[PDB]
């Protein structure tokens, strides 16, 4: 597993922008968005892994991600709790 940030695809970022209402997109937006998503995922996943490690588990459950997001201030509905 290496260089997986390229999995966030240019059409995918374009689709997300279109959902956000963007009409025209510069060519340098894709790298910036990849970096921003990398940072956000790093924070959320670190918190979730801490929660899973506290329970002496080896599987990251959806409840752990929900707790991590709630701690970050981004409470998510529909996945329990």
């Amino acid at each position: 597993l290496r260089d997986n940030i390229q999995g966030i695809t240019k059409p995918a970022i374009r689709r997300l922008a279109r959902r956000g209402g963007v009409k025209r997109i510069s060519g340098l937006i894709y790298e910036e968005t990849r970096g921003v998503l990398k940072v956000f995922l790093e924070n959320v996943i670190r918190d979730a892994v801490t929660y899973t490690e506290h329970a002496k588990r080896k599987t990251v459950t959806a409840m752990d991600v929900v707790y991590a997001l709630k701690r970050q201030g981004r409470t998510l509905y529909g996945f329990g709790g």
Partner: protein, 92 residues
């Protein structure tokens, strides 16, 4: 009678800066800061205990709350300090 962390903050300051004083407003700021971080760590420990269906707050809960709340270098140094304090406490 009103309780405050002013005495212990002063002792820590004398340990770290023996010749440096502290004003009353700064001491109030320090007391508020200590209370804030205490309440934050305790609240996270409470949430961790409730999520895991545990009736007791132990050192594991406080350590995990510290790791969740404090940023990286601060978190690791605080974890080391807490582990050292607990290890010394159990062996005395």
């Amino acid at each position: 009678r009103k309780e405050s962390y002013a005495i212990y903050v002063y002792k820590v300051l004398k340990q770290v800066h023996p010749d440096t004083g502290i004003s009353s407003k700064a001491m109030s700021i320090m007391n508020s800061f200590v209370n804030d971080v205490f309440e934050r760590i305790a609240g996270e420990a409470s949430r961790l205990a409730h999520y895991n269906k545990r009736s007791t707050i132990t050192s594991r809960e406080i350590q995990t709350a510290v790791r969740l709340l404090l940023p990286g270098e601060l978190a690791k140094h605080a974890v080391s300090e807490g582990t050292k304090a607990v290890t010394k406490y159990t062996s005395a």
